[PDB]
Amino acid sequence: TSNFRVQPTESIVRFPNITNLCPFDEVFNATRFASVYAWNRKRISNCVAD
Amino acid sequence: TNFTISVTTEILPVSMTKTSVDCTMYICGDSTECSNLLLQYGSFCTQLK
Ligand SMILES: *[C@@H]1O[C@H](CO)[C@@H](O[C@@H]2O[C@H](CO)[C@@H](O)[C@H](O)[C@H]2NC(C)=O)[C@H](O)[C@H]1NC(C)=O
Ligand SMILES: *[C@@H]1O[C@H](CO)[C@@H](O)[C@H](O)[C@H]1NC(C)=O
């Protein structure tokens, strides 16, 4: 007539592990910034953004 | 003028293992949207059972 099965309740696996590989603080906490005519272009890849 | 007695084997199958299948478990299992979608197919699962 039917089947017997219990349902799950929570969805958690292990833990978070990002650690912001790339130093965004290097480009965001600096004593000197570029100008409007000559703006410094930085390419960030192979990291994690938080 | 003489005779011999011989024994020969004869193997005949009778049955196999009885099998039962649940359609909603075998197809998707623990998916609610799949469960709601499968009821639009009619009595296919009932016919298979
Ligand atoms: C019919 O065949 C059987 C066996 O094929 C014969 O029995 C044998 O007889 C000889 C001597 O007569 C013995 O040395 C064997 O040991 C017997 N065999 C067995 C299995 O016991 C029998 O003699 C034959 N009868 C006739 C009339 O030919
Ligand atoms: C980095 O940022 C913090 C908070 O905005 C500031 O106090 C600190 O002076 C900064 N570092 C430098 C080297 O300016």
Side-chain angles (χ1 to χ4, degrees):
Chain A
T1 181
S2 169
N3 314 278
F4 167 80
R5 184 212 189 277
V6 291
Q7 290 258 317
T9 306
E10 65 268 5
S11 180
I12 47 173
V13 180
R14 183 48 55 154
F15 248 107
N17 202 343
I18 271 229
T19 84
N20 200 58
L21 319 172
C22 38
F24 277 106
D25 207 35
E26 201 270 331
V27 66
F28 288 147
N29 220 15
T31 186
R32 192 255 180 192
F33 280 166
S35 299
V36 285
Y37 57 91
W39 37 274
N40 192 21
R41 167 155 279 184
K42 186 173 182 177
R43 164 79 74 84
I44 321 170
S45 183
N46 264 10
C47 85
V48 285
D50 301 279
Chain B
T1 62
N2 212 354
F3 49 88
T4 180
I5 303 297
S6 176
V7 179
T8 64
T9 52
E10 178 152 286
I11 297 103
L12 295 176
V14 165
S15 168
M16 62 305 297
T17 74
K18 307 156 60 174
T19 308
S20 303
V21 59
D22 186 27
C23 83
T24 183
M25 162 56 218
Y26 163 69
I27 287 167
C28 53
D30 57 321
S31 301
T32 62
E33 49 266 18
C34 176
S35 86
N36 295 115
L37 178 60
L38 294 174
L39 269 295
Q40 322 286 334
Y41 268 42
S43 64
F44 267 53
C45 296
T46 309
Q47 217 175 349
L48 291 193
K49 276 190 285 184

